[PDB]
Amino acid sequence: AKMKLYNFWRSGTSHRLRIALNLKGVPYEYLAVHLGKEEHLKDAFKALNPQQLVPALDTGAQVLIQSPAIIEWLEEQYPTPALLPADADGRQRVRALAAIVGCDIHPINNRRILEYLRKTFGADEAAINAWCGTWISAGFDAYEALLAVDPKRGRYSFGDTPTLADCYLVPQVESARRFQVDLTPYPLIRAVDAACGELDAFRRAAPAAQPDSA
Amino acid sequence: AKMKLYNFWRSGTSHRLRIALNLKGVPYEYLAVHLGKEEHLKDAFKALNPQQLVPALDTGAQVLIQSPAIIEWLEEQYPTPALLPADADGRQRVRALAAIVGCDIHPINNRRILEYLRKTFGADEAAINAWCGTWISAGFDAYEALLAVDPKRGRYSFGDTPTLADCYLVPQVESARRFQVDLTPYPLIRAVDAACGELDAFRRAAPAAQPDSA
Ligand SMILES: N[C@@H](CCC(=O)N[C@@H](CS[C@H](CC(=O)O)C(=O)O)C(=O)NCC(=O)O)C(=O)O
Numbered sequence: 486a487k488m489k490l491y492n493f494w495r496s497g498t499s500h501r502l503r504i505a506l507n508l509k510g511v512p513y514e515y516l517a518v519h520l521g522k523e524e525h526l527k528d529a530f531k532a533l534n535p536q537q538l539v540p541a542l543d544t545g546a547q548v549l550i551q552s553p554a555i556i557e558w559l560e561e562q563y564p565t566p567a568l569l570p571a572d573a574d575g576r577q578r579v580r581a582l583a584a585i586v587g588c589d590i591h592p593i594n595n596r597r598i599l600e601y602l603r604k605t606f607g608a609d610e611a612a613i614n615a616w617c618g619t620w621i622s623a624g625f626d627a628y629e630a631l632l633a634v635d636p637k638r639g640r641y642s643f644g645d646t647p648t649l650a651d652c653y654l655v656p657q658v659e660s661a662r663r664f665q666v667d668l669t670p671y672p673l674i675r676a677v678d679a680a681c682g683e684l685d686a687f688r689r690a691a692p693a694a695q696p697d698s699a
Numbered sequence: 700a701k702m703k704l705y706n707f708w709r710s711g712t713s714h715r716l717r718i719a720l721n722l723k724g725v726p727y728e729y730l731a732v733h734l735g736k737e738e739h740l741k742d743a744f745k746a747l748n749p750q751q752l753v754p755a756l757d758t759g760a761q762v763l764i765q766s767p768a769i770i771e772w773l774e775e776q777y778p779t780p781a782l783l784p785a786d787a788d789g790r791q792r793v794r795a796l797a798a799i800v801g802c803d804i805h806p807i808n809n810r811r812i813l814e815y816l817r818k819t820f821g822a823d824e825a826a827i828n829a830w831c832g833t834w835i836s837a838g839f840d841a842y843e844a845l846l847a848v849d850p851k852r853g854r855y856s857f858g859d860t861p862t863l864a865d866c867y868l869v870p871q872v873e874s875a876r877r878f879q880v881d882l883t884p885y886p887l888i889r890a891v892d893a894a895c896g897e898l899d900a901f902r903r904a905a906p907a908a909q910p911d912s913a
Pocket residue numbers: 493495496497498499520525537538539540550551552553592594595596597598798799802803
């Protein structure tokens with residue numbers, strides 16, 4: 486028995502979890518679920534995950550869903566390197582940074598939402614881009630402001646080691662680029678993204694590096 | 700110094716955090732931020748929370764944001780009663796249930812999103828209700844299915860005691876009622892909501908019980 490990651494190359498939440506798995510050095514089988522072909526909406530995937538979203542992680546004993554919960558599980562199950570700080574204040578700050586992305590940006594721009602905008606509200610692609618940029622810019626305004634007020638911060642979102650906040654931020658910056666969001670206002674975010682981009686664990690997790698990529 | 704909770708009566712994330720505070724028996728000063736009057740969008744609130752959303756919790760030493768992160772902080776800071784189980788599997792499951800609501804339902808139906816639908820896409824109130832019901836029903840389909848397959852469950856989302864999953868679920872059911880979502884398909888969810896509704900900590904946290912309520 487071994488871990489199986491049901492996921493997709495060009496998927497922010499998949500990318501997020503791949504970064505965390507790679508940072509922990511945890512081996513996994515990559516099982517592509519082709520979202521463009523709507524494979525996640527088939528009964529076969531529903532049997533694994535009733536929510537019919539990616540990623541899902543089969544540990545060999547059970548199927549875990551929800552990247553935020555899976556990542557917290559990885560942190561506890563595979564201690565080294567730590568992706569959360571040891572102190573209560575730092576724990577809260579890193580979780581808050583992650584949740585800005587995980588709650589207040591990513592879900593709003595997810596495929597199913599954009600499909601609803603297109604099919605119910607008749608959104609064209611300019612309108613889709615304007616929607617996505619609205620939520621990314623609002624979230625990045627806050628994330629950037631938080632990066633600025635932290636005096637102890639190094640190269641990454643928190644301190645001078647990668648944390649789970651970076652696992653959320655990096656895929657979100659990639660989505661921002663996809664939707665042609667002006668990132669000029671976010672130099673601290675851009676610097677964190679660049680620093681993470683130097684690391685093997687992040688490079689190996691990037692959409693373009695995946696088996697199912699174009 | 701003491702706890703100051705910046706929040707609003709008719710607010711799902713405020714309600715969510717109020718439940719957790721009440722379960723912990725942690726005293727706090729209720730500081731109303733009137734969302735209808737757009738008080739959260741004023742510079743005074745921006746100075747407290749750069750994201751300009753509620754809730755924010757001033758501990759007396761610093762201002763915490765992001766209800767998921769604040770609730771995790773409360774669990775660690777105020778151990779009794781435990782709102783998370785002790786075992787890795789249970790921890791992950793409770794976090795996953797919470798994240799279905801906190802990531803994949805609540806943010807999609809938030810005020811700012813509905814405002815954008817109205818002002819950019821010309822949505823009338825029937826269209827707003829149809830949008831909200833789409834995401835609530837999808838999330839509740841998954842949540843209901845997950846409740847059904849847990850054989851160790853008592854009256855609540857997980858186990859025999861309230862957990863942070865219930866803190867997220869109860870406000871989400873209230874929002875469902877607000878948007879006239881058919882809850883007939885979700886008898887397990889309705890039973891959890893009813894069970895939580897018997898408890899003082901939940902009753903005291905409900906929108907209609909707040910100082911700034913109608
Ligand atoms: N809170 C959950 C959210 C998972 C879910 O949003 N996953 C996306 C992940 S793929 C999505 C693809 C896209 O938006 O183009 C992305 O994040 O990039 C989903 O499978 N989309 C399919 C759909 O909306 O039909 C989690 O973090 O695991």
